[PDB]
Amino acid sequence: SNDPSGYNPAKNNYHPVEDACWKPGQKVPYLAVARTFEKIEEVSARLRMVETLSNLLRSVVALSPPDLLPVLYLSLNHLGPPQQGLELGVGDGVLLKAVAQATGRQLESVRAEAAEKGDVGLVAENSPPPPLTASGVFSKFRDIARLTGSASTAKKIDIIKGLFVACRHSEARFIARSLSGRLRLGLAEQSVLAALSQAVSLTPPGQEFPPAMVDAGKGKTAEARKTWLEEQGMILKQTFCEVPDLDRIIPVLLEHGLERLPEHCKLSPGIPLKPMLAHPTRGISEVLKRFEEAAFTCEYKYDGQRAQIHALEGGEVKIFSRNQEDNTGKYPDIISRIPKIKLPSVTSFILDTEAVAWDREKKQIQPFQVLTTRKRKEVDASEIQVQVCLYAFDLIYLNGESLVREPLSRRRQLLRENFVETEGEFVFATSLDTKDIEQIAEFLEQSVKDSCEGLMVKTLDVDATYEIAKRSHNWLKLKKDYLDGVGDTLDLVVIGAYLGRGKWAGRYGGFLLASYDEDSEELQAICKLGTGFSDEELEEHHQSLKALVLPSPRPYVRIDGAVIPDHWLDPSAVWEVKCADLSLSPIYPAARGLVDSDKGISLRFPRFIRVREDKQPEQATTSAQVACLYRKQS
DNA sequence: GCTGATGCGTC
DNA sequence: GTCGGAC
DNA sequence: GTCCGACGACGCATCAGC
Ligand SMILES: *OP(=O)(O)OC[C@H]1O[C@@H](n2cnc3c(N)ncnc32)[C@H](O)[C@@H]1O
Ligand code: NA
């Protein structure tokens, strides 16, 4: 209706027609989306965020149904279905250059302000064409992603500058955040799905305008309304988990409604699905708690990458990553061995496996780092140098039957009976069915001796299905580095700090750490650190370290190719840091030359544990000790 | 034709 | 990937 | 328990600059 500047989607008793800031048939203004984002970031209760987004979506459904799909993508900061692999090719680098040119400022002034403010959007905002539309912005995002080849970056920057030129009010803030891949509203995929099912439930699509039914919940008690919306939410959520593709779902949702959705969109080979995830567990006793009276199995947790393998009726094979990226082209070796792993009675399947690097000469697992050296796309079978062994642990679909609602006890049995193991090519995950604490503890220890991270734990019959909408983190993961007093901890020196973002703007969000090389009496950067501290600890760090800020680095500190810290720090603080493994680093100088001529050592999954108030830098972990820790990984 | 910086996926 | 915090 | 924002190392693929 009126100026989108005053649009209030957090309004109590929000009316999808009377409270919209645009007219029926009008394109949804982008400022309407931005104002919704603003009202979402103002609150901390997710349910209030969902309500606010639901209000916007109800207006879109009632007034401008063609804009529902772009509005949803803008709210997710997605470009399209993940298996299509669309990429902006735009990060803070390209974006800050576009802002500098748009605002006519020096790139270094923009870069410094962005770091101080903790957000690129704030610089673009505080620094004539028609108003932007939601579908117009989304299409320009897609134009950026389709630009390739030489001189393509300059063309991307041209589009970004044109967007910023047309921005009003808060629009530039959220364009910049979206382009940088850091929307971070506090509302993401789960809340967007909750808002969508609520929106189409309360304001059914496909009504003749003006819609006779703008609030289908008004005739229900609060109790009945909540039960109804929860059921509708599960329909949408479970369908999406099986078909996480809005290009497919939304046209069906608009035409046939949410109740008929499962009839049109069903799990099928060749369409990636969401994978089942795992919740961390701190000890074997904790496991026995959450699985008190439910039989469960323990499996080795292999150190590779997830490979969801689809065999379609007719013989076509597709492979997808855990985030639904198409990996078919990177695994020609897997595609060729499918006839060898499945019995001839199998006509279609979806397998859940871990692809692990495998040394055929030595017949043993290789580290994850080796696996990542494989090529990623347009790979021909003859050129493969790092061989892969598949460790299969689940079966989601078989001979036309979805197993999503079947217990693991049955899925595992169909897996074990219809597929064939070959050493070093296709194996079932090593497993143990027991409830004895002593056998589990020995099994955990043996998993690490056999080159694995620890154990996966899964119920066999109680809440043991593959229904992600019911619970996405339905499995438990028990890694040895979760256990207190177990795993590698290091005492490292804080040599630099990185300015924080969003909530921590003006404070520190990360730090640069170093080990002490006795042979050269130098502090060598080993890794950055940005997790493990409580909010109180991170605030105290910002306080205690202010007295250490240096204008210039000490001459005995070496960081080589590490990211230069925003603030150098006088080497003094020593922190205890835990990691899962030590890796061979091309960038960090710590211990460079002690295990490899050109590469130093860094930490895998580093996290802060506590301050070592009783240690000075000269008693910190030495580069020689780092090298020793790396070697003992064998 | 090559190198290094950047982007974005893996874990 | 790990972690902490609001709900 | 759920969800989400904070942050980590690392590789290939790509393209700007040379
Ligand atoms: O730490 P995390 O949540 O990413 O762990 C889950 C991942 O672990 C991998 N994995 C390895 N071995 C298994 C088994 N046996 N079962 C399930 N997952 C397993 C997967 O890649 C998973 O995403
Ligand atoms: Na990243």
Side-chain angles (χ1 to χ4, degrees), chain A residues 299-302 306 322 354 393 458 477 479:
Chain A
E299 299 177 342
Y300 284 6
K301 188 184 191 298
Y302 297 87
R306 211 180 189 144
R322 75 122 67 189
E354 189 80 352
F393 53 82
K458 315 171 179 171
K477 56 182 172 184
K479 310 188 178 182

Side-chain angles (χ1 to χ4, degrees), chain A residues 50 71 84 192 196 268 278 380 397 628:
Chain A
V50 172
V71 169
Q84 285 171 14
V192 170
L196 178 58
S268 71
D380 188 80
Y397 186 101
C628 185

Side-chain angles (χ1 to χ4, degrees), chain A residues 326-377 379-499:
Chain A
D326 194 331
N327 289 352
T328 305
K330 94 191 286 186
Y331 293 119
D333 47 332
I334 301 308
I335 297 171
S336 67
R337 86 169 58 130
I338 297 299
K340 189 182 189 178
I341 69 165
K342 67 154 184 143
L343 292 174
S345 62
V346 178
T347 60
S348 58
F349 67 74
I350 299 174
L351 276 168
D352 217 357
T353 77
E354 189 80 352
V356 180
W358 179 263
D359 185 339
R360 287 183 175 168
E361 295 172 346
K362 294 180 184 181
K363 300 186 186 301
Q364 70 181 9
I365 290 171
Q366 296 182 303
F368 170 75
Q369 228 187 324
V370 177
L371 180 63
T372 60
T373 64
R374 306 215 353 169
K375 296 185 164 170
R376 284 196 303 183
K377 53 211 269 196
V379 186
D380 188 80
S382 58
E383 308 302 337
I384 290 168
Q385 297 191 304
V386 177
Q387 304 301 330
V388 164
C389 180
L390 294 176
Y391 290 91
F393 53 82
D394 218 326
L395 181 69
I396 305 165
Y397 186 101
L398 180 63
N399 298 337
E401 185 197 357
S402 170
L403 308 180
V404 160
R405 290 176 162 78
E406 302 293 311
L408 175 58
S409 62
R410 179 175 184 257
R411 301 200 313 274
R412 184 178 63 173
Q413 204 57 28
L414 294 175
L415 173 59
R416 293 161 161 188
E417 289 175 351
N418 293 278
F419 297 82
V420 179
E421 303 183 280
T422 298
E423 187 189 31
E425 291 176 25
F426 182 88
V427 180
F428 302 128
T430 302
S431 68
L432 175 63
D433 296 13
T434 184
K435 54 192 300 187
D436 184 277
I437 305 175
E438 187 174 346
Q439 293 182 25
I440 296 174
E442 176 54 36
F443 196 60
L444 173 61
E445 287 296 331
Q446 192 62 42
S447 75
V448 174
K449 291 177 187 173
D450 294 337
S451 307
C452 294
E453 301 178 331
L455 297 180
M456 298 294 301
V457 190
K458 315 171 179 171
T459 55
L460 288 162
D461 294 287
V462 182
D463 298 323
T465 74
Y466 208 95
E467 297 172 86
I468 280 70
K470 178 171 160 188
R471 170 171 294 171
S472 51
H473 295 71
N474 200 39
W475 302 336
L476 306 180
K477 56 182 172 184
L478 174 58
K479 310 188 178 182
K480 262 239 292 191
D481 57 283
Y482 296 165
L483 309 173
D484 234 319
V486 191
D488 288 328
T489 60
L490 296 82
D491 300 332
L492 300 171
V493 182
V494 190
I495 55 164
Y498 302 91
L499 297 174

Side-chain angles (χ1 to χ4, degrees), chain A residues 483-547:
Chain A
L483 309 173
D484 234 319
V486 191
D488 288 328
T489 60
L490 296 82
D491 300 332
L492 300 171
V493 182
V494 190
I495 55 164
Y498 302 91
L499 297 174
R501 295 184 179 80
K503 148 158 72 167
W504 294 94
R507 294 182 163 97
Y508 298 148
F511 305 89
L512 183 63
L513 308 179
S515 61
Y516 173 49
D517 187 87
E518 301 163 298
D519 290 337
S520 63
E521 292 183 275
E522 288 182 345
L523 286 166
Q524 299 172 318
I526 185 164
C527 73
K528 297 185 293 185
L529 189 73
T531 190
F533 1 76
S534 66
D535 285 7
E536 192 175 4
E537 287 175 319
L538 185 54
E539 183 177 347
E540 286 178 347
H541 290 341
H542 183 256
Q543 286 299 310
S544 57
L545 297 172
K546 70 197 164 171

